[PDB]
Amino acid sequence: MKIRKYMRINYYIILKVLVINGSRLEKKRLRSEILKRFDIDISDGVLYPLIDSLIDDKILREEEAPDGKVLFLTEKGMKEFEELHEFFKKIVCH
Amino acid sequence: KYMRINYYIILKVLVINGSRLEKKRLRSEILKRFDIDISDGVLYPLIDSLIDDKILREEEAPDGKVLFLTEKGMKEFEELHEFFKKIVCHHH
């Protein structure tokens, strides 16, 4: 296996927070969710570009809703999460 | 600069090998231990950068240059390991 572009902790964390919330989360809550679940504070200027890349690569989907935009994890994204989860488990965990 | 995960894998492979490893065996060891293929194009300059950071040191020897994780190096791995472990392993 070669190292691939999403093998970064912040991508894993974003995908994990989606899976945690049943593959659906309002965009305005992502930063808070990450902070409360992982104790990590990602700035806006770093976070939302990561989100954009995921959305434009069809890992995430975004639907415009009246009370904020909603993020969805796609089938492609769930498969990527599973790949990333196995990768990080293999190199980090016992 | 390179993706940080490479830095972690390098330090981990050194720690697993008792903080010492022949430079030539690093690529093979990473593949053996983790089934991860990392290029010499990434590995070698990254090693030089970690040497400038005093994270590794490089002894000359036959049958080749030997890499050593410093005390600084070991502390930096532990910190990063603890950081990743809480995120990834048995989290929530």
From TrEMBL, chain A:
It comes from the Viruses. This is Uncharacterized protein.
